[PDB]
Design a protein around this ligand. Structure first.
Ligand SMILES: *[C@@H]1O[C@H](CO)[C@@H](O)[C@H](O)[C@H]1NC(C)=O
Ligand SMILES: *[C@@H]1O[C@H](CO)[C@@H](O)[C@H](O)[C@H]1NC(C)=O
Ligand SMILES: *[C@@H]1O[C@H](CO)[C@@H](O)[C@H](O)[C@H]1NC(C)=O
Ligand SMILES: *[C@@H]1O[C@H](CO)[C@@H](O)[C@H](O)[C@H]1NC(C)=O
Ligand SMILES: *[C@@H]1O[C@H](CO)[C@@H](O)[C@H](O)[C@H]1NC(C)=O
Lengths: 248, 596
């Protein structure tokens, strides 16, 4: 999308791999302002909002908290308390046209600054004087949207950069977007420290003859100790025998 | 609600639309110049007419915002260049007549031939033709024949056209509130609205004369030495006391005396500084030339060139059918698009010209953050002197031993520096009297001090007074001899080459004072000193956003044009010429002694 009409995509109920995005070397700019990639792998968030637009290379620095400029005032305002990531890469091989790609617009004139994450696709004629516009173009009445040129022979700083901004947030709601869980291999018949779906402990994990019902995951004895469990990777039942400590 | 915010919105809109249309126009001009095709000529004409119509419409719209109520000086600088009506203040038929006169003078200048009277069988144009016979030939009669033939043909074909061009340009400048068209030409050096740093446009004709009265002894000694040496090749044609004939000056017009060096060399038995044999024995290429020049620029601390410069420039003749205009031109298309169009071969002259054009490109890069009206030189001399800084610095033996090109045991004795300073004198201080003479003559013609029936009489006397050159045969007003030059016949201001030749020695002196060079100025190298590059880049990045007096004072500490760095550059040469001219007639009186 163009930056005056930036696309916003709501992301929820899924597992997100930010490590492929960070490890991709094609991104010319990867700035995160309240998180880390390991933190992104270890923080669960309720909502992820993907804002996508095309700007120039010079306009990439304006996508930040506390910045000022034609994009940051009149097109896309980021709040000062932003917790998210800004990802930018050069798109000269796709967006640029040899005759000029005039299809990517941006808002040059507006009466007031934007509130954070506001969008305004209105084509209202900017009245810069006391003389009324009455819709028509005049000597002080300008059309607010202007076209980027985006030719492939432009220098860096005028070349088209696709920018995706991810906004993460925690609300008074159950959080569901959370990073890739790295499960290791399963080792049986040894006293190991097990961590099964957030249930941790120490024990010997052996094969079990207890046939669980499909909705049940863990097993408890009379004394409310976890002695049976289901492996989440392969649906098999394992007994947890305590490690064989004794008196000497 | 105020004039400031309306003017700023108008300037933002004009900057964006003008950058777009100027990039289209410059791309069309580039596509025409690197590849002559009639479709490319039509595209270039269409883009130029679109930019001209757009600039005329925004000049019409810019008159509604008055300059008297604007307090911001940058808005004043951006709006004075828009509110100038230019040639559109005239009627449509007069503007059409002036444009038709300009195009027909350009076409008749371009299409001149050197075909002999009573021998019309074959001839060439000026560039393969007249340049060789006037620059390289040692004969008197064929040089005189070619000179008289070309001046006669251009004089009869352009004397009405140039007279009407003078009348229409005078009416244009008097309609545009200037005194004359020379006063319009001096509006590039005008500074107003700044206290202390202001510079009247009538002060330029005082400063140029004030600097030429201290140039003139050195030029008198150089002219005396050239006149004494040129009698060896022309024994009976040149008098020992009188002035030089016009056609022997190593050029068509005597603008550059640089081809007279082989006739006037002081010490021919010394080895030369010509590195072309070692440059072709090391198997250099144009990419190697530009890479070593870019290494020279990054040694000074200026940023290196973009990948678009390397992937888009035309550094070699493209091929068989892709003809190109082989003149060296640096292109700033805007929006980060810098490129060089220059046909190259392995030559020290092409090496120095590559340094010159990359100096122009670096100066275009430095003010790229400025708005569109202010992306130009501080005056018309700055943009050509910034390349000549690189041309002076890249010719030094210290730089030619830094890149390993010159032999390391080449000894910089007295003679091998005197015969280099003489070549630099014939290139640089040889063009100052011709430039000042021609622009003084044009200012008196456009002012109206010279009537039409006294143009040539006043010109040759002025040539006798200033340049010290007599005519080969007496001419009258049937000819128009100065208009045969490229710049005057195509409406180009030509005093840009005078201030360039002074500013290049001021900046280099400042940048040799910054680089802590202990030795002489002609042996100074700008390289390897980042503190000189910061001093230069603090001025190159301003553009037209600041007065040229302040941008000059930021470098040299003086807010006016000055001539002392040029004099103390040539000080060993000046002492050698003063010790050489013990018995020769130094200087001249105006005379017809060599020929009546
Ligand atoms: C999970 O992946 C394992 C890997 O072997 C596969 O066998 C199994 O079918 C998948 N699904 C479930 C529900 O376990
Ligand atoms: C130069 O112009 C000719 C004329 O048609 C064309 O065939 C050729 O492709 C052009 N070359 C370039 C590099 O544009
Ligand atoms: C002109 O206005 C701009 C923006 O308002 C400001 O940054 C600049 O300093 C002003 N220039 C002068 C000379 O007041
Ligand atoms: C310009 O110099 C920088 C600094 O080392 C370098 O990273 C960059 O690759 C250079 N650009 C080119 C085109 O060589
Ligand atoms: C600049 O410094 C480099 C690094 O020491 C050196 O190789 C080069 O010769 C120097 N150039 C000059 C002109 O001193």
């Amino acid at each position: 999308a163009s930056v005056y009409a930036w696309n916003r995509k709501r992301i929820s109920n899924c597992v997100a791999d930010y490590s492929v995005l960070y490890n991709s070397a094609s991104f010319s700019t990867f700035k995160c302002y309240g998180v880390s990639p390991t933190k992104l792998n270890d923080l669960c968030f309720t909502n992820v909002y993907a804002d996508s637009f095309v700007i120039r290379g010079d306009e990439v620095r304006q996508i930040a908290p506390g910045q000022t400029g034609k994009i940051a005032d009149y097109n896309y305002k980021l709040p000062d308390d932003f917790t998210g990531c800004v990802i930018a890469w050069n798109s000269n091989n796709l967006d640029s046209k040899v005759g000029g790609n005039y299809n990517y617009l941006y808002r040059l004139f507006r009466k007031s600054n934007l509130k954070p994450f506001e969008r305004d696709i209105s084509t209202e004629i900017y009245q810069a004087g006391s003389t009324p516009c009455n819709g028509v173009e005049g000597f002080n009445c300008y059309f607010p949207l202007q076209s980027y040129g985006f030719q492939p022979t432009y220098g860096v700083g005028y070349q088209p950069y696709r920018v995706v901004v991810l906004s993460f947030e925690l609300l008074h709601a159950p959080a569901t977007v959370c990073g890739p869980k790295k499960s290791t291999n399963l080792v049986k018949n040894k006293c190991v420290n097990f961590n099964f779906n957030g249930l941790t402990g120490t024990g010997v994990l052996t094969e079990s003859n207890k046939k669980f019902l499909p909705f049940q995951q863990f097993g408890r004895d009379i004394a409310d100790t976890t002695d049976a469990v289901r492996d989440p990777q392969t649906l098999e039942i394992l007994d947890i025998t305590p490690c064989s400590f004794g008196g000497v | 609600s105020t004039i400031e915010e309306q003017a700023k919105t108008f300037l933002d809109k004009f900057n964006h639309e003008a950058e777009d249309l100027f990039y289209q126009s410059s791309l069309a001009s580039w596509n025409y110049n690197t590849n002559i095709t009639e479709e490319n000529v039509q595209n270039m004409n269409n883009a130029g007419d679109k930019w001209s119509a757009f600039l005329k419409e925004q000049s019409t719209l810019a008159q509604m915002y008055p300059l008297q109520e604007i307090q911001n000086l940058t808005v004043k600088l951006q709006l004075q260049a828009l509110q100038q009506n230019g040639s559109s203040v005239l009627s449509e038929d007069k503007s059409k007549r002036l444009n038709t006169i300009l195009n027909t003078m350009s076409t008749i200048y371009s299409t001149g031939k050197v075909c002999n009277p009573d021998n019309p069988q074959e001839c060439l144009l000026l560039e393969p033709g007249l340049n060789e016979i006037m620059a390289n030939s040692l004969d008197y009669n064929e040089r005189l024949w070619a000179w008289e033939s070309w001046r006669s043909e251009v004089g009869k074909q352009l004397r009405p056209l140039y007279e009407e061009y003078v009348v229409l340009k005078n009416e244009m400048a008097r309609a545009n509130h200037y005194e004359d068209y020379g006063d319009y030409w001096r509006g590039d050096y005008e500074v107003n609205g700044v206290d202390g740093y202001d510079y009247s446009r009538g002060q330029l004709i005082e400063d140029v004369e004030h600097t030429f009265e201290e140039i003139k002894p050195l030029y008198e000694h150089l002219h005396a030495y050239v006149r004494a040496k040129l009698m060896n090749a022309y024994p009976s044609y040149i008098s020992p006391i009188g002035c030089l004939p016009a056609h022997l000056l190593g050029d068509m017009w005597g603008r550059f005396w640089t081809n007279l060096y082989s006739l006037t060399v002081p010490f021919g038995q010394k080895p030369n500084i010509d590195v072309t044999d070692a440059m072709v024995d090391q198997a250099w290429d144009a990419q190697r030339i530009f890479k070593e020049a870019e290494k020279f620029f990054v040694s000074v601390g200026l940023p290196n060139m973009t990948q678009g410069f390397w992937e888009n420039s035309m550094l070699t003749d493209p091929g068989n059918v892709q003809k190109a205009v082989c003149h060296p031109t640096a292109w700033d298309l805007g929006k980060g698009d810098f490129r060089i169009l220059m046909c190259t071969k392995v030559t020290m002259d092409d090496f120095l010209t590559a340094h010159h054009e990359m100096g122009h490109i670096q100066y275009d890069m430095a003010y790229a953050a400025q708005p569109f009206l202010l992306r130009n030189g501080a005056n018309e001399g700055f943009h050509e002197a910034v390349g000549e800084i690189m041309s002076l610095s890249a010719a030094t033996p210290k730089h030619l031993k830094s890149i390993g090109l010159l032999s390391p045991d080449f000894q910089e004795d007295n003679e091998t520096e005197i015969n280099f300073l003489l070549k630099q004198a014939l290139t640089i201080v040889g063009t100052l009297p011709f430039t000042y003479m021609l622009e003084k003559w044009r200012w008196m013609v456009f002012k109206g001090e010279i009537p039409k029936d006294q143009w040539m009489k006043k010109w040759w006397e002025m040539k006798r007074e200033i340049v010290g050159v007599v005519e080969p045969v007496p001419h009258d007003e049937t000819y128009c001899d100065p208009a045969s030059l490229f710049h005057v016949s195509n409406d180009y201001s030509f005093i840009r080459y005078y201030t360039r030749t002074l500013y290049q020695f001021q900046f280099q002196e400042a940048l040799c004072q910054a680089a802590k060079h202990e030795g002489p100025l002609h042996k100074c190298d700008i390289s390897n000193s980042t503190e000189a590059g910061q001093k230069l880049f603090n001025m190159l990045r301003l553009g037209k956003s600041e007065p040229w007096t302040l941008a000059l004072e930021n470098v040299v500490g003086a807010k006016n044009m000055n001539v002392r760095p040029l004099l103390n550059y040539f000080e060993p040469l000046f002492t050698w010429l003063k010790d050489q001219n013990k018995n020769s007639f130094v200087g001249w009186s105006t005379d017809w002694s060599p020929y009546a």
